[PDB]
Amino acid sequence: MTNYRPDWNRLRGLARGRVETCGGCQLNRLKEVKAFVTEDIQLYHNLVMKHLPGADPELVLLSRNYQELERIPLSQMTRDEINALVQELGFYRKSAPEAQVPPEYLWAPAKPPEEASEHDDLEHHHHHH
Secondary structure (H helix, E strand, O other): OOOOOOOHHHHOOOOEEEEEEEOOOOOOOOHHHHHHOOOHHHHEOOEEEEEEOOOOOEEEEEOOOOOOOEEEEOOOOOHHHHHHHHHHHOOOEOOOOOOOOOHHHOOOOOOOOOOOOOOOOOOOOOOOO
């Protein structure tokens, strides 16, 4: 039944994610993995792929300013599972790279700024005809 859960306490700050993997290498053996890092990886906002000299295909949940907070391997899991995780976090997925993103997930997976949904000086709040 799996029933897995991340370390949200250790992940605190995750505002973006980047996948690191050997550019001059291929994930033929990891047919699944390769997929996630070829098709959807471009559709997933704030989720970009990386071509390192020679590293393993691992996700890097950074903290906005590229403050790598945590890195988890993907070679072990399957595309279907790896996608589940991304969704679990809050990442957005579109149909195309040139596609847009609704206000709901505009800043996703990050939260909207404080000074935006807060109001108290609405017409002095007294009386209105």
